[PDB]
């Protein structure tokens, strides 16, 4: 329920392995159908600068969640 430590960076600053971790707990902490983890092949950078539309268009049942999951981690 407590993000990673890894993940308590800026997200900018994850790594493509920070990222896919970012999804698996996410997946988890949302009980997600699990169907999103080789959509965002990508450092934290380059998710930071995708659009809600984009996650919508990468994962189509969860992108929304995940996008203000991120926008919420990006405040911290």
Same mark, same amino acid.
């Given at each position: 329920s407590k +993000? $990673?430590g890894r993940?308590?960076i800026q $997200?900018? +600053?994850?790594?493509?392995?920070?990222? #896919?971790?970012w +999804?698996r707990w996410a997946?988890?902490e /949302?009980? #997600? $159908?699990?169907?999103?983890?080789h @959509?965002?092949?990508?450092? @934290?950078?380059?998710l930071c &600068?995708?659009?809600?539309?984009?996650?919508?268009?990468?994962? $189509?049942?969860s @992108?929304?969640? #995940? /996008?203000?999951? #991120?926008?919420? &981690?990006?405040?911290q």
């Amino acid at each position: 329920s407590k +993000l $990673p430590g890894r993940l308590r960076i800026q $997200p900018a +600053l994850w790594s493509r392995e920070d990222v #896919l971790h970012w +999804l698996r707990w996410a997946e988890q902490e /949302y009980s #997600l $159908p699990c169907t999103a983890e080789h @959509g965002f092949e990508m450092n @934290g950078r380059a998710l930071c &600068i995708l659009t809600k539309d984009d996650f919508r268009h990468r994962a $189509p049942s969860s @992108g929304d969640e #995940l /996008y203000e999951l #991120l926008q919420y &981690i990006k405040t911290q």
